[PDB]
Amino acid sequence: AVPGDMVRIPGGTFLQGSPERTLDWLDREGQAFPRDWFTDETPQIPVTLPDYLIDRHQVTVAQFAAFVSRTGYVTSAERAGGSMVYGEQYWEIREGACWHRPAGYGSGIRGRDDHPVVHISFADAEAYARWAGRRLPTESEWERAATGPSYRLWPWGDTWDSRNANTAEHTAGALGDLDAWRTWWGAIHAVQGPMPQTTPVGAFSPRGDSVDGCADMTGNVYEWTSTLAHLYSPATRCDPTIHLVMGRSRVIRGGSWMNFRYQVRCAERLYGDPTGWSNFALGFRCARDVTA
Ligand SMILES: [Ca+2]
Ligand SMILES: [Cl-]
Ligand SMILES: [Cl-]
Ligand SMILES: [Mg+2]
């Protein structure tokens, strides 16, 4: 019935999105991003779902390599010659970056095959799920699995704990101030062959886990959903760059090792170009109906 590597999310009706008092609170917690960077989570909406299955972990390097080994699959990033990595200053195209060269030519997996696979395009993700006899999760399925049957900021509750997940809150906390974290980000990314900052799937289990058992629904890597970017209501108004991708980008969830706490909440929405774009911080996990 239920594959040992998935968990059953019980059917029910939940409130998708984030309430006004949460947005107010993001205003007040000295967050850079203005209010209209979070309004795409609003208004909350009643979403009804059946029981459904979702992977416990993100797809690992090792699992994707089995897919590639058996099928010969070639990823978008390999056909293009490159993929995106965040450099010293901004996002950059890195020649040779792909799932097995996560920092480009001169890098490799180096025994980190229990980490989530990255440089996965939307089509790379859909193809692996087909092969596995599964699919991507919808955004609704993803958020439900993350927040639980009632609303909460992070999968473990409403109180932040940098020890519960792979985010930049841990690393900045360890370096002592936000100055020292910027100075660090400099010194590592200055060529210096950037050490990967992903973590093995399930490394922060069980403390970081969601109520239903999903691991790493916070931080580590961004995750594709199958959902086409859409507003929760026709009157929602966000930053123009967000309307620009409405109706064409696919929703990306969960934040990444690079994010701080406000960009890795259960309800946070990101968006990605589904036509052969990928980056070194973006992977996925699968879902499935209870009955294929
Ligand atoms: Ca967002
Ligand atoms: Cl952030
Ligand atoms: Cl299915
Ligand atoms: Mg994530």
The reply to whether 118 sits in an annotated binding site is no
Answer whether 285's CB lies under 8 Å from 54's CB. Answer: yes
Q: Quote the CA–CA distance of 28 and 78 in Å, as a whole number.
A: 44
Amino acid residing at 83 = S
The reply to whether 176 sits in an annotated binding site is no
The reply to whether 268 sits in an annotated binding site is yes
Q: Quote the CA–CA distance of 254 and 271 in Å, as a whole number.
A: 11
Question: How far, in Å, from the CA of 29 to the mean position of ligand 4?
Answer: 22
Cis-peptide, bond into residue 43, ω within 30° of zero: yes
Q: Which residues constitute the domain of residue 36? A: 1-292
Q: What is the resolution of this structure in A?
A: 2.2
**Backbone angles phi and psi of 153, in degrees to 5:** -60, -55
Q: Quote the CA–CA distance of 278 and 222 in Å, as a whole number.
A: 11
Q: Quote the CA–CA distance of 222 and 257 in Å, as a whole number.
A: 9
Q: Which two tokens stand for residue 204?
A: 């922060």
Question: How far, in Å, from the CA of 91 to the mean position of ligand 2?
Answer: 14
Looking at the structure of the chain, the number of domains it has is: 1
